[PDB]
Amino acid sequence: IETVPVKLKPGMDGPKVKQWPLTEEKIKALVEICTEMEKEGKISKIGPENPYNTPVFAIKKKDSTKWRKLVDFRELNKRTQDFWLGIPHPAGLKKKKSATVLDVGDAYFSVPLDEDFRKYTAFTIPSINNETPGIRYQYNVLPQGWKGSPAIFQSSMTKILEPFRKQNPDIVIYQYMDDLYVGSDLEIGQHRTKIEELRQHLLRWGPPFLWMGYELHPDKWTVQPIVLPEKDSWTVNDIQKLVGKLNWASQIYPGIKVRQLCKLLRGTKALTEVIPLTEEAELELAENREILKEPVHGVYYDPSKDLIAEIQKQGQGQWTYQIYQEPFKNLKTGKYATNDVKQLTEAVQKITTESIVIWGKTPKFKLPIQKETWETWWTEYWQATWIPEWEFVNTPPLVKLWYQ
């Protein structure tokens, strides 16, 4: 065929990312996988004259006994030239009742990759205990997970989807990297069939389900407003916890007043000493309570800014997240309810999927876990075909107190 010349952002060089240690199981998997991709020429072994490197992982397919090879092309995509016709984000997707995700990465393996770019796709299969060189490869076809691949296949893609799109324009179809987000409002039963049909309508040209194969439901997604304790009697402690949370939240909703509540806190009373609430204080709480019933006004999403996400471990298998771009200016806030890591990763993928669906981009996460732990286990529970960017942090015991 004809390969479309791709270039790195000006002046930039290729990635030389370290490969994180893999378990024999995952290593055995990747070997099996790559050996066949080689026979079929999707990949080729490389020489020492290639200094670049990208991390590969093996993850499980949900409801499939097969392994998926996952290449962390995050640094590569970052150094890859932007693309200059786009298929913008259908705001209509978030509203749809049901949405299913399909892995269409196999499509890319039918398009050749510009011979001069191939070197940058180098990745390595590590060897246990370094007893062997480590199998080195590079791509010849468009690789799954590279930002270029969807772009370069856009044409060939719109083509195969014009018929279903007009023969079924009640369905919204969004593509993001290796994923295809199919949305509708049909009955969950109708949905599954219209879906299956697109599967073969795709098989016709040359898609196992994603996110448990399972369903999604963007209509039922809502913000987790800041809440206050609604209790019988109010003790001194209760009130301090109250004022503290209030004060904190005042920075967002400046309409919150604490004056009357802070007045019940005069004197050095016994923390357990119950305090009946005055009339003024009673109205004050109520007003504050009204103000919090909804997300602060004025917060709009800026396509030119990063989408940030923070997660908090609440306990009992419960987490709290917030997606914003500017401090205190949340675009969204949510909740999520095995082991700590498994949960967290399911949550991350969940929040990412939402970001994609709502804005069409992945968030930059802040996780409450040590790097080595994450690096160690994330691939054991991961199922997405994309990888959000992430960093690690030390959650301040107060912020957690202020959520959920």
Partner 1 sequence: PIETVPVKLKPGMDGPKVKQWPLTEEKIKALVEICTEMEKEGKISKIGPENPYNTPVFAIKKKDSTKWRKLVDFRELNKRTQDFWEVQLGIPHPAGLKKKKSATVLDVGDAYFSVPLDEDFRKYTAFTIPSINNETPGIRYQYNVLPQGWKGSPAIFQSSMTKILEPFRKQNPDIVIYQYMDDLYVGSDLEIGQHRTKIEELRQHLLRWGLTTPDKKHQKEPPFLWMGYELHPDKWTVQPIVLPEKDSWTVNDIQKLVGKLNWASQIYPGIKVRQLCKLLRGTKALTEVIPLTEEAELELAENREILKEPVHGVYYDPSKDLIAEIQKQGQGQWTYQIYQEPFKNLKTGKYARMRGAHTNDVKQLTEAVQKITTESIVIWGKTPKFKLPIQKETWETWWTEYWQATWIPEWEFVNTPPLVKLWYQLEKEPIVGAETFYVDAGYVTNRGRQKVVTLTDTTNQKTELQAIYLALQDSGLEVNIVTDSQYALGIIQAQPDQSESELVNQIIEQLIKKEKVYLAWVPAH
Residues forming the site for partner 1 (CB under 8 A): 21-25, 27, 46-51, 53, 122, 128-133, 136, 235, 237, 240-241, 243-244, 247, 268-273, 312-313, 315-316, 339-344, 367-370, 372-373, 376-377, 394-398, 400
**Complex with partner 1: residue 199 or 342, whichever CB lies closer:** 342
**Complex with partner 1: residue 6 or 367, whichever CB lies closer:** 367
**Complex with partner 1: residue 3 or 376, whichever CB lies closer:** 376
Smallest distance from partner 1 to CB 340, Å: 4
SS (H, E, C) 10-72: CCCCCCECCCCCCCHHHHHHHHHHHHHHHHCCCEEECCCCCCCEECEEEEECCCCCCEEEEEC
What are the CA-CA distances from residue 395 to residues 102, 324, 370 (Å)? Answer: 35, 17, 12
Smallest distance from partner 1 to CB 46, Å: 8
Q: Which residues, in sequence order, are CB contacts of 192 under 8 Å at separation 6+?
A: 100
What are the CA-CA distances from residue 242 to residues 3, 246, 314, 335 (Å)? Answer: 63, 6, 18, 21
Residue 295: both structure tokens together: 């997300």
Smallest distance from partner 1 to CB 345, Å: 10
**Complex with partner 1: residue 36 or 196, whichever CB lies closer:** 36
Smallest distance from partner 1 to CB 270, Å: 4
Smallest distance from partner 1 to CB 268, Å: 5
**Complex with partner 1: residue 20 or 301, whichever CB lies closer:** 20
Give the whole-angstrom CA distance, residue 16 versus residue 28.
Answer: 23
Q: Which residues pair with 176 in a beta bridge?
A: 179
**Complex with partner 1: residue 126 or 207, whichever CB lies closer:** 126
Q: What is the separation, in whole angstroms, between the first and last Cα of the chain?
A: 55
| Element of type H or E holding 239 | helix 236-250
**Complex with partner 1: residue 94 or 366, whichever CB lies closer:** 366
Of 380, 396, 390, 374, nearest to 70 by C-alpha is: 380
Residue 47: both structure tokens together: 């020489």
Helices and strands, counts by H and E, the chain: 12, 14
Q: Residue 8 in 3-state DSSP?
A: strand
Smallest distance from partner 1 to CB 109, Å: 25
**Complex with partner 1: residue 2 or 131, whichever CB lies closer:** 131
Smallest distance from partner 1 to CB 11, Å: 10
Q: Which residues pair with 323 in a beta bridge?
A: 309, 332
SS (H, E, C) 187-231: CHHHHHHHHHHHHHHHHCCCCCEEEEEEEECHHHCCCCCCCCCCC
Annotated binding site for Mg(2+): 103, 178-179
Annotated binding site: 103, 178-179
Smallest distance from partner 1 to CB 87, Å: 35
